[PDB]
Amino acid sequence: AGSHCQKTSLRVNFEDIGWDSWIIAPKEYEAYECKGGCFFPLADDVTPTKHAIVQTLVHLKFPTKVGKACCVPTKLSPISVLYKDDMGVPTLKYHYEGMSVAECGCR
Amino acid sequence: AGSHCQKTSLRVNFEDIGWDSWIIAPKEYEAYECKGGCFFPLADDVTPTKHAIVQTLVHLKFPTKVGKACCVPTKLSPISVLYKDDMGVPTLKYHYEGMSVAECGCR
Numbered sequence A, B: 001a002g003s004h005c006q007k008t009s010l011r012v013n014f015e016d017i018g019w020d021s022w023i024i025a026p027k028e029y030e031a032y033e034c035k036g037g038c039f040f041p042l043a044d045d046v047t048p049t050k051h052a053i054v055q056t057l058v059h060l061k062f063p064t065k066v067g068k069a070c071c072v073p074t075k076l077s078p079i080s081v082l083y084k085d086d087m088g089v090p091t092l093k094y095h096y097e098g099m100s101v102a103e104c105g106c107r
Helices: A050-061 B050-061
Strands: A006-008 A011-013 A023-025 A028-030 A033-035 A071-084 A090-106 B006-008 B011-013 B023-025 B028-030 B033-035 B071-084 B090-106
Touching (some): A028 A090, A033 A071, A033 A090, A050 B090, B028 B090, B033 B090
Antiparallel strands (some): B023 B071
16 A cells, blocks of 8 residues: 655765765655556556656556566756865755656656 | 666567557567666766665675666657557557666666
């Protein structure tokens, strides 16, 4: 129950991923993530493409030859970061795009 | 070598997936599929989002808690199908959208 593709929390520390060299702040942010399966019956809000549906059916028929559709971010949102200028000046990037999950779906 | 996210062939038979009831023709089509890993170093044309990069690094640090980015279709193309009208009349759907992979990427 409720095991399908959905947005869940993912707290990211920039030091952990080696970005603290060029990102002064914040130290961490909420990137979220997309988790869950793409299998029938699908959840209503998965917004699945026709190809994802086709591939899921093919995987059912031939599970060893063809993989499943994948639960992935389908829309992303920006965050603000404070980063080192090439001259060293800490500088605000106000909309640093593509950093946090707005919506998930099967693709 | 060349083990990264790319488009590969996938031949789909509509009877195999139970769509032959409402799809008269064609019998099969080339849907392709997206196969390969999302891991560093990335291929040039993966067009990875920032979130996919972040998640891949987090997965490296914490492989059991956080999954990898996923190789998925990022652009799809239509095909034509001949389908049964609700009145039974075979009818052409000229651009049946979202049926075949145009491009793959890590998301």
